[PDB]
């Protein structure tokens, strides 16, 4: 029997199905101000039949910015714009979480406050690219700037920025928040020994490496409620040159046991980047499942059939689809009916306007 189209309690909200829209950076916000737009509102409204929409990654602060065109949730103007977007999703009977990030070293000095180097756990270049805008406003890929290591006394400010962004998110009408602790961004930069060479209380042992993300979790649970908080992790494998170190499984299980103590709404596991990699072992999935007592969302080149299999095995609760949600606003109906999926147009994933954004048809 199919379970994808059955309801699921996700902390404080109830999803009517298990087909979630993964967080998808689309880089269509207004500059100056990193302001969401009515076009973005239309895009999200089109996808409101998702069991849960998880927004594009959204800055907690101006310092958090690493991509031209990515929205923020730190300014009054951003709060006002997001309020209209969440109202539109709710008018269509949807549910929407905001994914909150700090990009850390995956950034460029030209888009940082004061034109300064971005920050990270350690002063190590990401050795990758980010997306800026050229003089005509078009997306361009540019090598990342070498970061400055955060001073110990700057850490409380980072925690406060997450806390403040969650206050703002609650005000803006989001149903949940997802902390971006994956994919080589700031929280993951602290988690991974490959990017964290600190020798203070925020590096070294796994307890120290997870310290920042757990302080953030505690701060945001206190600001709102634990049943409003999810977290995305990518703790097995390599993502944007950030591996998970030489004890990745044990370190992941430590973090997950710690997260379970807070009673948070969900754990969202990004299992692979677009280039793929070794699948999660069923033993690992079992170890995660016995340790965490909230919703588990799986993501990364899923099919509906794989999601059904893992839901049936009692190992995950929901699936997040990324690219299929870019191209199929009514992905839920298509998967329910076994309809074909619209052809994807990758050239318009990042930047631009309505074309390749709001022009993918429903059935
Ligand atoms: C254009 C694009 C933007 C993405 N932006 C984000 C993001 O903002 N936050 C995030 O955690 N993952 C991001 N991802 C990863 C997706 O959430 C998803 O995990 C990935 O695309 C693999 O799932 P899929 O095979 O269903 O597309 C992005 C992926 C794509 C293709
Ligand atoms: O893992 N991915 O295939 C993409 C990740 C991603 C892409 C753009 C912005 C934030 C992200 O986490």
What atom in ligand 2 is closest to the CA of residue 183?
12
Contact 91, 49 (CB under 8 A): no
Query: Does 291 appear as a known binding residue?
Result: no
For ligand 2, the distance from its centroid to the CA atom of residue 1, given in whole angstroms, is: 33
Query: Does 18 appear as a known binding residue?
Result: no
CA angle 264–286–312, rounded 5-degree value: 90
What atom in ligand 1 is closest to the CA of residue 234?
11
Buried b (16+ CB within 10 A) or exposed e, 299-315: bbbbebeebbebbeeeb
Strands (E), the chain: 8-10, 13-15, 19-21, 53-59, 96-101, 119-120, 129-133, 139-143, 148-149, 176-181, 229-233, 266-270, 295-299, 318-321
Number of domains in the chain: 1
Contact 20, 321 (CB under 8 A): yes
How many Cβ atoms are within 10 Å of 356's Cβ, its own excluded? 19
Q: How far apart are alpha carbons 313 and 335 in whole angstroms?
A: 20
Tell me the two tokens of residue 172.
């803006």
- Alpha carbon separation from 114 to 19, 85, 174, 303 (Å, rounded): 42, 30, 31, 44
Where is 87: in which H helix or E strand? helix 76-91
Q: How far apart are alpha carbons 120 and 240 in whole angstroms?
A: 15
Q: How far apart are alpha carbons 287 and 50 in whole angstroms?
A: 29
- Identify the residue whose tokens are 């609650």: 170
Contact 314, 285 (CB under 8 A): no
Nearest CA to ligand 2 atom 3: 273
Nearest alpha carbon to residue 24 among 82, 79, 97: 97
Contact 117, 73 (CB under 8 A): no
Nearest CA to ligand 2 atom 12: 183
Tell me the two tokens of residue 60.
């907690």
Q: How far apart are alpha carbons 337 and 302 in whole angstroms?
A: 18
Resolution (A): 1.2
The residue range of the domain holding 298 is 1-363
Q: How far apart are alpha carbons 201 and 245 in whole angstroms?
A: 18
Angle between helices 248-261 and 282-291 (to 10 degrees): 20
Contact 108, 125 (CB under 8 A): no
- By DSSP bridging, strand 139-143 and strand 129-133 are antiparallel
Residues with CB under 6 A from ligand 1: 22-25, 56-57, 99, 180, 182-183, 232, 270, 299-302, 321-324, 349
Q: How far apart are alpha carbons 241 and 344 in whole angstroms?
A: 26
- Residue length of the chain: 363
CATH number at residue 39: 3.20.20.70
Contact 90, 172 (CB under 8 A): no
Phi and psi angles of residue 178, each rounded to the nearest 5 degrees, phi first: -115, 120
Contacts for 198 with CB less than 8 Å, ≥ 6 apart: 121, 122, 149, 204, 208
Q: How far apart are alpha carbons 349 and 146 in whole angstroms?
A: 27
Phi and psi angles of residue 253, each rounded to the nearest 5 degrees, phi first: -70, -35
- By DSSP bridging, strand 53-59 and strand 119-120 are unpaired
Strand partners, 140: 132
Q: Which of 106, 268, 322 maximizes ligand 1 atoms within 8 Å of its Cβ, making it the mutation to test the pocket?
A: 322
Q: How far apart are alpha carbons 142 and 133 in whole angstroms?
A: 9
Q: Which of 25, 67, 99 maximizes ligand 1 atoms within 8 Å of its Cβ, making it the mutation to test the pocket?
A: 25
Angle between helices 248-261 and 211-223 (to 10 degrees): 20
Q: How far apart are alpha carbons 169 and 74 in whole angstroms?
A: 9
Nearest alpha carbon to residue 298 among 273, 277, 332, 269: 269
Contact 61, 102 (CB under 8 A): yes
Method of determination is X-ray
- 359: DSSP letter: -
Query: Does 183 appear as a known binding residue?
Result: yes
Strands (E), 190-348: 229-233, 266-270, 295-299, 318-321
- Alpha carbon separation from 73 to 15, 98, 99, 181, 335 (Å, rounded): 24, 9, 10, 17, 33
Q: Which ligand is nearest to the CA of 238?
A: 2
What atom in ligand 1 is closest to the CA of residue 350?
1
How many Cβ atoms are within 10 Å of 361's Cβ, its own excluded? 10
Q: How far apart are alpha carbons 304 and 261 in whole angstroms?
A: 31
Q: Is the beta carbon of 273 within 6 A of some atom in ligand 2?
A: yes
Tell me the two tokens of residue 28.
């269509």
Contact 322, 24 (CB under 8 A): yes
Q: Rg of the chain's alpha carbons, rounded to an integer?
A: 19
Q: How far apart are alpha carbons 225 and 216 in whole angstroms?
A: 13
CA angle 61–137–344, rounded 5-degree value: 90
3-class SS at 166? Answer: helix
Contact 75, 87 (CB under 8 A): no
Q: How far apart are alpha carbons 188 and 97 in whole angstroms?
A: 20
Nearest alpha carbon to residue 101 among 31, 187, 173, 163: 187
Peptide bond into 32 cis (omega under 30): yes
- By DSSP bridging, strand 318-321 and strand 19-21 are parallel
Is 185 catalytic? The answer is yes
Strand partners, 130: 142
Tell me the two tokens of residue 203.
């590096």
Q: Is 62 exposed, middle or buried (0-12, 13-18, 19+ CB in 10 A)?
A: middle
Nearest alpha carbon to residue 22 among 51, 60, 65: 51
């Amino acid at each position: 029997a199919e379970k994808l189209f059955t309801p699921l309690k996700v902390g404080a909200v109830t999803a009517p199905n298990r087909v979630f829209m993964a967080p998808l950076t689309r880089l269509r916000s207004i500059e100056p101000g990193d302001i969401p737009t009515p076009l973005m509102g239309e895009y999200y409204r089109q996808r409101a039949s998702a069991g849960l929409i998880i927004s594009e990654a959204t800055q907690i602060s101006a310092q958090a910015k690493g991509y031209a065109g990515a929205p923020g949730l730190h300014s009054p103007e951003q709060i006002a714009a997001w309020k209209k977007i969440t109202a539109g999703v709710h008018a269509e009977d949807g549910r929407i979480a905001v994914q909150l990030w700090h990009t850390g070293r995956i950034s460029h000095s030209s888009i940082q406050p004061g034109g300064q180097a971005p920050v990270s756990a350690s002063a190590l270049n990401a050795n990758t690219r980010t997306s800026l805008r050229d003089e005509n406003g078009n997306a361009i890929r540019v090598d990342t700037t070498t970061p400055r290591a955060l001073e110990l006394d700057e850490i409380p400010g980072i925690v406060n920025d997450f806390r403040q962004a969650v206050a703002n998110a609650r005000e803006a009408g989001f149903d949940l928040v997802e902390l971006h602790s994956a994919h080589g961004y700031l929280l993951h930069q602290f988690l991974s020994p490959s990017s964290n060479q600190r020798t203070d209380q925020y590096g070294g042992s796994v307890e120290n490496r997870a310290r920042l993300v757990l302080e953030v979790v505690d701060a945001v649970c206190n600001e709102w409620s634990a049943d409003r908080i999810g977290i995305r992790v990518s703790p097995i494998g390599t993502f944007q040159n950030v591996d998970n170190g030489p004890n990745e499984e044990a370190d992941a299980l430590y973090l997950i046991e710690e997260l379970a103590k807070r009673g948070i709404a969900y754990l969202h596991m990004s299992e692979t980047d677009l280039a793929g990699g070794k699948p999660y072992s069923e033993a690992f999935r079992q170890k995660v499942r016995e340790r965490f007592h909230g919703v588990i969302i799986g993501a990364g080149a899923y099919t509906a059939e794989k999601a059904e299999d893992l839901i049936g095995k009692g190992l995950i609760d929901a699936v997040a689809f990324g690219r299929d949600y870019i191209a199929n606003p009514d992905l839920v109906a298509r998967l329910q009916k076994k309809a074909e999926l619209n052809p994807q147009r990758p050239e318009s994933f990042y930047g631009g306007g309505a074309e390749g954004y709001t022009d993918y048809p429903s059935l």
